[PDB]
Amino acid sequence: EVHLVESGGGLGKPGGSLKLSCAASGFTFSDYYMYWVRQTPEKRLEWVATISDGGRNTYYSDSVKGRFTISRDNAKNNLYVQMSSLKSEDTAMYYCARGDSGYGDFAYWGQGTLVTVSAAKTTPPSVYPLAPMVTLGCLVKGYFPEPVTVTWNSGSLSSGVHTFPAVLQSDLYTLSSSVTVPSSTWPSETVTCNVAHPASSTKVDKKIVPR
Amino acid sequence: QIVLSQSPATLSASPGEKVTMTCSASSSVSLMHWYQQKPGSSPKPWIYAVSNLGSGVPARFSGSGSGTSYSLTISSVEAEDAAVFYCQQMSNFPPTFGGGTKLEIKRADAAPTVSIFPPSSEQLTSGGASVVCFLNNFYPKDINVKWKIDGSERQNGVLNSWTDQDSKDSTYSMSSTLTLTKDEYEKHNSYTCEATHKTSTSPIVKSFNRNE
Ligand SMILES: [Zn+2]
């Protein structure tokens, strides 16, 4: 199975630099052209750059030409993009994509890595348990930048979960996440929300106990 | 560059109904590609080279077009089709994308399941007090939420968030958070989250009392 995995995302200072990486596997990496495509917070998809199979040829969007550098390491199966002179328009989810052997379609995409360009301070979340079929929750308040990941019981409770999009207010995000379980399972069984905020190197586990 | 304009912005259909979305290009292109995207994931290849379905794409999807106008049709829409569809060309450099068309799948009206939570003892320990309300799995998306403290509506310091349409049951959900200081929170006793939805002529409420 073909796989593409981006890494390197996070907070970039305006005017600063940030390097993204994309690990490819499942195909002869050196036999394909590779692309970077981004999605802005308004959900617009915009092609960023192309690099030829051998790494000798490159193409850039007008927005990023002179600032970004696309490169590849055909021995390590890695695609890169070096960003410089970061602007607010660079704030986006960045995907690495592969085409096929040739209509110009993006046949394989990565999971994406989020880049936020801002002078606002990285702040860790404060995770609060929300105790009252029963509904429980977790409030992930006052963090920056996005993203955070929330799971319930390490992923085991995935059904009946609603993790809501974060809302920004005065340079800090807040999100909530609910989990609905049959009354026979809580409080007789333990329910824990697991929060990860990679930009602040924080992981928090909060068991929901009755009041 | 070639501008791709997609219409309509939003399609809304009941399961079994047919919908057609179009992608218009500022110049003639030889082919059109389409992607389907759901919240929390990358765009998935859906149609390549105008009419070829991607692997796993059901036969109810079809693509057609030529020149400056292309289309994507779903002959019988299903709950799983609730997604945003994007068109993309690579006939002129650079490759460009359309702004997407979102598909909303209609279902039988469903009442929000409302839940209210007082501030955690942990947050109170730091001087803050957020009261959270979840209004879960309802249809249609249109809903109003009010906060009441001791029998009167409270406005200011309320942050709301909505989820995208659920792919399994075609419902929406909303979170509402009222943030007060611990001092202000502790000056009152009754807290109510009040929803107004078309599935009930009366408001749907959930309350808690600080005496409890
Ligand atoms: Zn007061």
Phi first, then psi: what are they for A198, rounded to 5°?
Answer: -55, -35
Ion ligand 1, residues whose Cβ is below 5 A away: B 187
CA distance B123 to A186: 22
- In order of start, what are the domains of chain A with their CATH numbers? 3-117 (2.60.40.10), 126-204 (2.60.40.10)
CATH class name, domain B4-105: mainly beta
Phi first, then psi: what are they for B185, rounded to 5°?
Answer: -60, -45
SS (H, E, C) B110-167: ECCEEEEECCCHHHHCCCEEEEEEEEEEEECCCCEEEEEECCEECCCCEEEEECCCCC
Pairing of strands B10-13, B101-105: parallel
Residue A89's SS3 state is helix
Q: Which two tokens stand for residue B207?
A: 């309350």
Any CB–CB contact under 8 A between A131 and chain B?
Answer: yes
Domains of chain B by residue range:
4-105, 113-209
Does the beta-carbon distance from A129 to B96 stay under 8 Å?
A: no
Q: Which two tokens stand for residue B174?
A: 């909303």
Residue A21's SS3 state is strand
What distance in angstroms lies between residue B197's CA and the mean position of ligand 1's atoms?
Answer: 28
Q: Which residues pair with A134 in a beta bridge?
A: A181
Q: What distance, in Å, lies between the first and last C-alpha atoms of chain B?
A: 64
Question: Superfamily assignment of B113-209 in CATH?
Answer: Immunoglobulins (2.60.40.10)
What distance in angstroms lies between residue B177's CA and the mean position of ligand 1's atoms?
Answer: 17
Shortest distance, CA A129 to any CA of chain B (angstroms):
6
Q: Which residues pair with A168 in a beta bridge?
A: A173
Which residues, at least 6 apart from B183, have a Cβ–Cβ distance to it below 8 Å? B127
Does the beta-carbon distance from A164 to B162 stay under 8 Å?
A: yes
- Residue A15 near residue B62 (C-beta atoms within 8 A): no
- Which helix (H) or strand (E) segment holds residue B185: the answer is helix B182-185
Q: Which of B126, B132, B174 sits opposite A137 (nearest CB)?
A: B132
Resolution, Å (one decimal):
1.9
CB-based burial label for B187 (10 Å; 0-12, 13-18, 19+) = exposed
Any CB–CB contact under 8 A between B94 and chain A?
Answer: yes
Any CB–CB contact under 8 A between B122 and chain A?
Answer: yes
- Residue B65 near residue B51 (C-beta atoms within 8 A): no
Within 8 A of B48 by CB-CB distance, chain A residues are 103, 105, 107
CA distance B104 to A44: 19
Q: Which two tokens stand for residue B186?
A: 């502790």
- Residue B160 near residue B147 (C-beta atoms within 8 A): no
Strands (DSSP E) along chain B, which ranges? 4-7, 10-13, 19-29, 33-37, 44-48, 52-53, 61-74, 84-89, 96-97, 101-105, 113-117, 128-138, 144-149, 152-153, 158-162, 172-181, 190-196, 204-209
- The sign of the dihedral angle between the CA atoms of B196, B197, B200, B204 is negative
Does the beta-carbon distance from B97 to A112 stay under 8 Å?
A: no
Any CB–CB contact under 8 A between A132 and chain B?
Answer: yes
Any CB–CB contact under 8 A between A125 and chain B?
Answer: no
Peptide bond into B203 cis (omega under 30): no
The C-alpha angle with vertex A138 and arms to A151 and A115, in degrees rounded to 5, equals 60
Within 8 A of B49 by CB-CB distance, chain A residues are 103, 105
CA distance B1 to A204: 46
Residues 133-152, chain A, touching B (beta carbon < 8 A):
135, 137, 139, 141
CA distance B92 to A44: 19
Give the residue carrying structure tokens 């309509």: B8
- Which helix (H) or strand (E) segment holds residue B182: the answer is helix B182-185
Q: Which two tokens stand for residue B106?
A: 């209609």
